[PDB]
Amino acid sequence: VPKWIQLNNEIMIQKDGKFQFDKDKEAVHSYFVDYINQNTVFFHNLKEKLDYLVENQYYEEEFLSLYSFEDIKEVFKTAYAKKFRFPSFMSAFKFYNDYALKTNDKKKILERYEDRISIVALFFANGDTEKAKEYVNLMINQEYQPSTPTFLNAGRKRRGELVSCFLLEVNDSLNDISRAIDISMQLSKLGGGVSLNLSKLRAKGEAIKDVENATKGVVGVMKLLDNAFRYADQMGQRQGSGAAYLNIFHRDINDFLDTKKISADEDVRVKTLSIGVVIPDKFVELAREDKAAYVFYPHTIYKEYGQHMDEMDMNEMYDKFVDNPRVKKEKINPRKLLEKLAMLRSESGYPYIMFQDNVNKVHANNHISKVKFSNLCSEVLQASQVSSYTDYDEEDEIGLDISCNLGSLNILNVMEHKSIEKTVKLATDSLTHVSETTDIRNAPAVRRANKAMKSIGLGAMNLHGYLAQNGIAYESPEARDFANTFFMMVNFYSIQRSAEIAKEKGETFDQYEGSTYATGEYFDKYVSTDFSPKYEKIANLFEGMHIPTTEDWKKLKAFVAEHGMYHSYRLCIAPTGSISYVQSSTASVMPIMERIEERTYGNSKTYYPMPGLASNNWFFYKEAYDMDMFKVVDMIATIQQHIDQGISFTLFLKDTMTTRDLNRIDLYAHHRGIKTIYYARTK
Amino acid sequence: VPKWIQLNNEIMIQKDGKFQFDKDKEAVHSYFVDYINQNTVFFHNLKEKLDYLVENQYYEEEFLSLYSFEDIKEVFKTAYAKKFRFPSFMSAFKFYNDYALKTNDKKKILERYEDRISIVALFFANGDTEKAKEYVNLMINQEYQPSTPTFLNAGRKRRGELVSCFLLEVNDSLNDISRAIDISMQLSKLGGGVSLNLSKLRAKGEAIKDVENATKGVVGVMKLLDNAFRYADQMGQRQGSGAAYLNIFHRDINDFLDTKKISADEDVRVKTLSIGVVIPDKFVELAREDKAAYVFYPHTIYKEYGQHMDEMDMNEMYDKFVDNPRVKKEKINPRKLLEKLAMLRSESGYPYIMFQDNVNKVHANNHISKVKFSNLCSEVLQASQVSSYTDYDEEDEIGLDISCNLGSLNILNVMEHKSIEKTVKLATDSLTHVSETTDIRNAPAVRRANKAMKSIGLGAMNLHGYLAQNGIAYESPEARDFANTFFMMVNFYSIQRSAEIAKEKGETFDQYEGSTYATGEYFDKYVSTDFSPKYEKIANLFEGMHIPTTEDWKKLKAFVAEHGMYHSYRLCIAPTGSISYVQSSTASVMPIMERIEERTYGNSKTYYPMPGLASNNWFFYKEAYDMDMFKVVDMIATIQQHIDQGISFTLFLKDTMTTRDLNRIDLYAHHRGIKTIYYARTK
Amino acid sequence: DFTQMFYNQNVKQFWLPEEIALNGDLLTWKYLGKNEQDTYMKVLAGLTLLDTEQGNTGMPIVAEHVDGHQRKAVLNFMAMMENAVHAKSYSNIFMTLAPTETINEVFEWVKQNKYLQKKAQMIVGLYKAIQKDDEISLFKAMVASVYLESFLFYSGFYYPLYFYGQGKLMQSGEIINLILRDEAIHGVYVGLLAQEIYNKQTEEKKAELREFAIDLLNQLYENELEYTEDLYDQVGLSHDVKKFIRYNANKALMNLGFDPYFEEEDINPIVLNGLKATVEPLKDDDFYF
Amino acid sequence: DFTQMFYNQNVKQFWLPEEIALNGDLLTWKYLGKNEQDTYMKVLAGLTLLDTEQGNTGMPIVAEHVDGHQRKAVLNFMAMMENAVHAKSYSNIFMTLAPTETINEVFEWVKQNKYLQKKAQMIVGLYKAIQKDDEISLFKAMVASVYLESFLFYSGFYYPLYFYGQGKLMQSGEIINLILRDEAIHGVYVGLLAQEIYNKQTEEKKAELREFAIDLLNQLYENELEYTEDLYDQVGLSHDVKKFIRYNANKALMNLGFDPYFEEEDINPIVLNGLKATVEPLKDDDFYF
Numbered sequence A, B: 001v002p003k004w005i006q007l008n009n010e011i012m013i014q015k016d017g018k019f020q021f022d023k024d025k026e027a028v029h030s031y032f033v034d035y036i037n038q039n040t041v042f043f044h045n046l047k048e049k050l051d052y053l054v055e056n057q058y059y060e061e062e063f064l065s066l067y068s069f070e071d072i073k074e075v076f077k078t079a080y081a082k083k084f085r086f087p088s089f090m091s092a093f094k095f096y097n098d099y100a101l102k103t104n105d106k107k108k109i110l111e112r113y114e115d116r117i118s119i120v121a122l123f124f125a126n127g128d129t130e131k132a133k134e135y136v137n138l139m140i141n142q143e144y145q146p147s148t149p150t151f152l153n154a155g156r157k158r159r160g161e162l163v164s165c166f167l168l169e170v171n172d173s174l175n176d177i178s179r180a181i182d183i184s185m186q187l188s189k190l191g192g193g194v195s196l197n198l199s200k201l202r203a204k205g206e207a208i209k210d211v212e213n214a215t216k217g218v219v220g221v222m223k224l225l226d227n228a229f230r231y232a233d234q235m236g237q238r239q240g241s242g243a244a245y246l247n248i249f250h251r252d253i254n255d256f257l258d259t260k261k262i263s264a265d266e267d268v269r270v271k272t273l274s275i276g277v278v279i280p281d282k283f284v285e286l287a288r289e290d291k292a293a294y295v296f297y298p299h300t301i302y303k304e305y306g307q308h309m310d311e312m313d314m315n316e317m318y319d320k321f322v323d324n325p326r327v328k329k330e331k332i333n334p335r336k337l338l339e340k341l342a343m344l345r346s347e348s349g350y351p352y353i354m355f356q357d358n359v360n361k362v363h364a365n366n367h368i369s370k371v372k373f374s375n376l377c378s379e380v381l382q383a384s385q386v387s388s389y390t391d392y393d394e395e396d397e398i399g400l401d402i403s404c405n406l407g408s409l410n411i412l413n414v415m416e417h418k419s420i421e422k423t424v425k426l427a428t429d430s431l432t433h434v435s436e437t438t439d440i441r442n443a444p445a446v447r448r449a450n451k452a453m454k455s456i457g458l459g460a461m462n463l464h465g466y467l468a469q470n471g472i473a474y475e476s477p478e479a480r481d482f483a484n485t486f487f488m489m490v491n492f493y494s495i496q497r498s499a500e501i502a503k504e505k506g507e508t509f510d511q512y513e514g515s516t517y518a519t520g521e522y523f524d525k526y527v528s529t530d531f532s533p534k535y536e537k538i539a540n541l542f543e544g545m546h547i548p549t550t551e552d553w554k555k556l557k558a559f560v561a562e563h564g565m566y567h568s569y570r571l572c573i574a575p576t577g578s579i580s581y582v583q584s585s586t587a588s589v590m591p592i593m594e595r596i597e598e599r600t601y602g603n604s605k606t607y608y609p610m611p612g613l614a615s616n617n618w619f620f621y622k623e624a625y626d627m628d629m630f631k632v633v634d635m636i637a638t639i640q641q642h643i644d645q646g647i648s649f650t651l652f653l654k655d656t657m658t659t660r661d662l663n664r665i666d667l668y669a670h671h672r673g674i675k676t677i678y679y680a681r682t683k
Numbered sequence C, D: 001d002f003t004q005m006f007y008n009q010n011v012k013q014f015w016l017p018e019e020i021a022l023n024g025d026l027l028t029w030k031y032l033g034k035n036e037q038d039t040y041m042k043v044l045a046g047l048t049l050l051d052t053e054q055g056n057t058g059m060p061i062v063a064e065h066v067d068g069h070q071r072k073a074v075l076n077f078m079a080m081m082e083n084a085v086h087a088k089s090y091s092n093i094f095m096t097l098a099p100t101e102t103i104n105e106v107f108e109w110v111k112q113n114k115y116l117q118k119k120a121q122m123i124v125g126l127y128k129a130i131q132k133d134d135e136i137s138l139f140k141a142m143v144a145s146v147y148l149e150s151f152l153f154y155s156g157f158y159y160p161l162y163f164y165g166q167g168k169l170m171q172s173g174e175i176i177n178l179i180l181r182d183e184a185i186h187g188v189y190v191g192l193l194a195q196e197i198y199n200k201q202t203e204e205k206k207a208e209l210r211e212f213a214i215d216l217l218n219q220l221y222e223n224e225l226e227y228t229e230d231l232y233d234q235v236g237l238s239h240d241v242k243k244f245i246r247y248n249a250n251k252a253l254m255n256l257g258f259d260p261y262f263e264e265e266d267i268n269p270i271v272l273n274g275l276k277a278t279v280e281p282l283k284d285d286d287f288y289f
């Protein structure tokens, strides 16, 4: 066993009844003085390194050609001047195993952390040396972390796409289904997770040109998509991951759910395609009143009204659907469907739950389209227009397929540096650059939506780490007050940066004029309610930083009205799974699953303590499963009120609790304004 | 139990030690006195019937509008003047259960046999009343039978395409694979059987964008195609049928074959995807000499030579591939592979066997392309060019995808009417009309090849029926003499009609000038070898009909040289599954499987004796399984020497014979010039 | 001269109770009097006990002491039939016709019934007295086994056969006939093995073995009479069953090579009415024609 | 918790030798080299000899000492399969492939073979050491039985599976696959009976039984390596056979509820080719907060 492995395992060997957390630090030293420094490839100077990486097809030469070598040297020197040290063994291990650039045979390390950060910063700046240094300082301080696709692939010749998630709308036609399968394979080839809205597809037993009971429903398309994602599995490196979203009022909703039952037959079971359910407020109202609900056949509704079932408001059209004899429907028990959802989530963690009305009551771009589904991580909530892929030799009507670039603020590092504004603006600029340089030649709706919406996702990580390292319980009202203030600041500065980009470029996102940003409605709660901290401890935490007031929000509203906004969507809180290790941060705004996690790598086992875990903050690092899910819902709703897109909200459940407890948590989330629920992980 | 079913089951009841075959005739009468006439919709006049069928979206207005009502009435009167009577119960049952037009509620019969024949004739003639009457006389004499798609769908508004055999070339790309899946779905939606060539696809463990061990091979593509064919199942009417062809020198050939093993796992086995193997002469030579063979990685060959492995002659390329270090290959035992093929055919009848050099040594259009694969029934053998389907908003390079037009001569009815020439020419004209009226807007290469090649397949059936009713054993040399003469006359008149159509329209098929028809090579064996019958009995059978001599063939060769040939391909012998029942004929040129076949429809049993079966010809109606497969191979080769495309050749084996016997039959078929082997049906 | 043909007969007679659907007896069962149902349950429970011990103990122990792999294979197969097929079939019948409480009660009744305990004590005692390499103790156990197979089962078999012969409980009756068909061949086979041992003895020893067999038969018989009266008096059939068991006692003696002991009697005529493909490699000559 | 389920799986797997026609194997047998034919014969005799011990002693002795009518029935069924089905199947394969004199000589050789004898006598020794009413000695014998069923047979099964995966000796390979499928379930079942005893023990006694099992496994494994080289070096397969032994040793341990002893290894592909949360209804007022 390696020396650093033994040093890391020495953490759990208690001394005087206490964990040896400091041993972890020793491990990193070993991991660098025995493996990383020996396995790294050193050159005489930076010129030889850059030339070797360029000619050997490791780096794209275009982004490096925008800078003179003196500027690149200055950027690299700025990166190395911080003398960044990984405080935990797992941070360095995760970076050098998942994100550091290696040779073709993967026998040596070509990229250090500073090298990777410098390359990403130079790609972000697009020829601006000062901007590149700003990005270097932002990432080496670990205030901002680009998503895994962006951080791993920026400036690389053998790179994939920098966009993490893609959302596709599938129209009710064989041509559209085949095009959706093709685009899903193309985007999984690019490495991104693909989500498909199957609510427009007509249910099982519908007519294909006057011959009835002909359609296979959404389950056949689900099987096709599952095989497509199995085939396109990132060249066999990462398993192809897809998501299917169906409205709960679709007739196939049961069969949909039956794809995830552990007793499902092979002709129905789907195993590589995640499932999500979109629940309008009408379904929750029907379940609450115990009135029997009706699921609908989408094609009959489309024939009668000319629009898809998910294209209009069910809260106002459900009674018209039920009373219409030309609309076909089936009777269901909404409470039984809710119990089935809870049982399925207990068994397998599926489906994702999207509260459609919670998303669309604060959605700023309802004029473009209502949000009808979410992404594979159930945090992207954007307007999408379905595409009409016609026959060959016929022009296709290209719609809008959602796609946003992810980037997370490290809350602990951002607040320690007292740089919410600067970090938010620089992250917005980096995400705007990632969107601008993204061009996908096989997904036309994705390309058009990227060019028009200009949507980005700016997330946050290390919420629980910051709260526990500052002596604040994650479930406490003080923690929710901090989240309210911090994310109001993040939203304020993201809107300010979006408006500044719109002013400097003279262009807004497409159809911005009909948005609530243009009409000023979006700023209502910000121009009437003060989001400054209500607790003295939180206010002290925010000292040295100008917390925006109602007057600052009014000025920002006027600025947006004058100049517009460059981005249709700005903030989305992704799960941030593996890149949180490198940043020494807790995953996303979720509470920690465990204080010390035991992970098996190779034939060895390693223990990763939570960042900053110690004796004095052991009980502030409360495990998520031990927490009240209602207070976690309260925290997520408090954050969500300042996030325009959704938050990947994983439910952390105990084995003792029943499906009724899961249903109660889901209904409280819906009541509190939670937009989406990601996972039901049971301990 | 209905009266006609009792009268049909009375056949097996033996009187005086003989089957009551004549009772079947009585059954037909009952089937018409009790059921057909009662459930047949009658109109006051044909005008009312045509108006009702057109208005209720049963027929098409376009083809009926080309004639005055007097001409349509005259065509119907010509059809009804024959007073055609089905000689067996199963003929009428199959027609009125499969082909007769029924109401939307499927309880009444709108079309009789004469009505359907008249409608198909009017569709064929395209406005010529005399031509329509000629077609009516052809089909009511049952000399020619349009295929199930053409016969069932001609003149019907609610219909699939008139072509059901489609051959697709799949290029080695994700875009091409997705396009192939889409086209397969679209053609299965039209009701056609789709065959895909997977030899150009790179094997498992190949590089994608210079990353190693990334390709899933052809088995993942087969899984995708199997899912696509399961999804597209004719609006839930018939099981989606598809075929995949792989060259035996493709490295995936074992895994390909492993998709049909019973022991194969769920992630390996494809259930609704037929498989065929293309066997070049090089593989047979390697197996014969017991030299170990090499299966090659197609992408390495493409990188080294710039052409696909299946696009070049393996006979001259195999040694260069083996000696090339940059071509990756795996060692195999060709005799072990042959034994595996025989074992798999014994277990499941798969794969289909295509002898590439047997096809291509007589292929007339090798300049366009060599025949690389066959159809789902393993009888279509045509030149195909792969298409380069690029990314979106980029122009695709459309190639040639095979789609031939099926139609079968009834050898008994044709020869008893002494009308080989007239029937062949009229069938060629009808096939040309159906090929010209076919327009598929979702298969670009299929449409392009249909427009360019103008390839049709004119088959024959009732060969064994005709031979048995004339006191000739199917395995006798006299039967082969008759087949030689009859199919040489069929080829002569098909070529003459093709040249006449080319002269009339002033156009040949695309790239005809490079064909062996243009150079006169095709006629070589016809201008030197006399194909007149060598037996007096066969000559007396051909009495009253002019048998083309060598001088006639020289005149035809000169005529083709002067005027060209309209069809790239003219003759292919399809299995003729259900139309053989309606025509009261034995299926294809195959020998009969059973003298009397027992079938179960609903909860009732039915008995179909072979047409013309009696005590006198009971011995001549020898069952296929009792026959020597070498003599069946000899007869099929005798026919194949006059057929430009292949013949659906099913092997009929006993359970006693082993895989050595199957391999011996396959090798004798290869030796005798058999182009394709369809199935290995074990009794 | 016989084991191979018994092996073939035993394996060709293989069956499972699940092959016979029992829900068809539901109505003819419902229609029987309480006395009739009680006797029927108890009769089958007595049979279950006998097969339990024949399968667990009797057949395996005889298999252990009999020499020859083929003889052992037959005896092992017969043992499996006793407990894996026969004893289990009775539970299939019980589970179809009777509620759980009645089933529980009848199994409690076997434990406390003095005649059933006595017959089990006697038969199993002889099985457990077998001494390795001692052919006389083995003979005694084989006599006991023949008496179980060909005599003791029959006080039980009477009643299902009596109903079968009247067209009542015919699915249960089909199971019982299959069991009876098996026991008949089991009794013959074990009888032949017993005769082998008997034939090795002196005339004096043979005389003692006949005494043992007849004394044992009489002792079992007297107990079976009391058992029969206890079960059948409530259905009026005791005298008829007694004639049947005497008939079968004679068959058991005959299976042992002894003369019949009881005089012939007329048995109820109702009960009499109750009775991949092969693969060859390719030769170089298969590539040339 | 498990005996009725295993009863079902066992009886539904019932088969007879006569079902597979063997004569067509001669069409591939004639094409094997002398070393291949020699190894096959020796392996086959090894399996035959070990399986006879299991039929005559292993299964019947365990059936004798295990309490429970249903367990005794399942165990009887398994003993029947050894003696009536498996033993006849091995004999049939031999009689098809070799003349009488060759069979007698191979069995003479394998009977004298040091590595075959070592393992055969080690297993038989543990069966002979079972004492009445001593569950520790029964457990030790069950461990031995599981090691035979789930581990020791597999150095032998390798070769028929190797041919079967190549299209050679398909009829006898089909038979071997059916036998192997029976031994797999036998091993799992006896394993569950051993775990039942193990779980009734103290922590110190458990640790002692674990040491026994691992020590026994080690002795058998070291002899298997020698057995393997002795048979398979002449056909160049020993390296791959050793991987197959370890993989099956791990399965045997898992059957006994123990952790795998050996690291995971991939197996020869030719041989491979041969081979709820509590639902609680919503009570209303759960929709209001």
Ligand SMILES: Nc1ncnc2c1ncn2[C@@H]1O[C@H](COP(=O)(O)OP(=O)(O)OP(=O)(O)O)[C@@H](O)[C@H]1O
Pocket (backbone or CB within 6 Å): A028, A029, A032, A033, A037, A084, A085, A086, A087, A092
């Ligand atoms: N935790 C760590 N994170 C990142 N790099 C590290 C870490 N520990 C060691 N290294 C690398 O290994 C080298 C070993 O040097 P070390 O940290 O022991 O101190 P040093 O030799 O006094 O110099 P310096 O600390 O100034 O780099 C470091 O210079 C650095 O490049």
Ligand SMILES: Nc1ncnc2c1ncn2[C@@H]1O[C@H](COP(=O)(O)OP(=O)(O)OP(=O)(O)O)[C@@H](O)[C@H]1O
Pocket (backbone or CB within 6 Å): B028, B029, B032, B033, B037, B084, B085, B086, B087, B092
């Ligand atoms: N074998 C048959 N094949 C086809 N149609 C038949 C057959 N038998 C009877 N029919 C139908 O039933 C009708 C009655 O025929 P039938 O044998 O009674 O005498 P017919 O002289 O042909 O009668 P019609 O006056 O109808 O022409 C036929 O006209 C035809 O429509």
Ligand SMILES: Cc1cn([C@H]2C[C@H](O)[C@@H](COP(=O)(O)OP(=O)(O)OP(=O)(O)O)O2)c(=O)[nH]c1=O
Pocket (backbone or CB within 6 Å): A171, A172, A173, A174, A175, A177, A201, A202, A207, A208, A209, A210, A214, A215, A216, A217, A220, B189, B231, B232, B233, B234, B235, B236
């Ligand atoms: C062709 C086909 C369609 N479908 C379903 C899936 C599609 O969502 C739906 C629409 O198919 P379409 O491609 O729209 O078929 P169509 O346009 O010819 O019929 P229509 O005019 O009624 O639109 O039909 C199947 O389930 N199986 C099939 O094989």
Ligand SMILES: [Mg+2]
Pocket (backbone or CB within 6 Å): A172, A173, A174
């Ligand atoms: Mg449509």
Ligand SMILES: [Mg+2]
Pocket (backbone or CB within 6 Å): B172, B173, B174
């Ligand atoms: Mg390519």
Ligand SMILES: [Mn+2]
Pocket (backbone or CB within 6 Å): C051, C054, C081, C082, C086, C087, C179, C182, C183
């Ligand atoms: Mn019994």
Ligand SMILES: [Mn+2]
Pocket (backbone or CB within 6 Å): C054, C078, C082, C149, C182, C183, C186, C187
């Ligand atoms: Mn018995």
Ligand SMILES: [Mn+2]
Pocket (backbone or CB within 6 Å): D051, D054, D081, D082, D086, D179, D183
């Ligand atoms: Mn065995």
Ligand SMILES: [Mn+2]
Pocket (backbone or CB within 6 Å): D054, D082, D149, D182, D183, D186
């Ligand atoms: Mn066993």
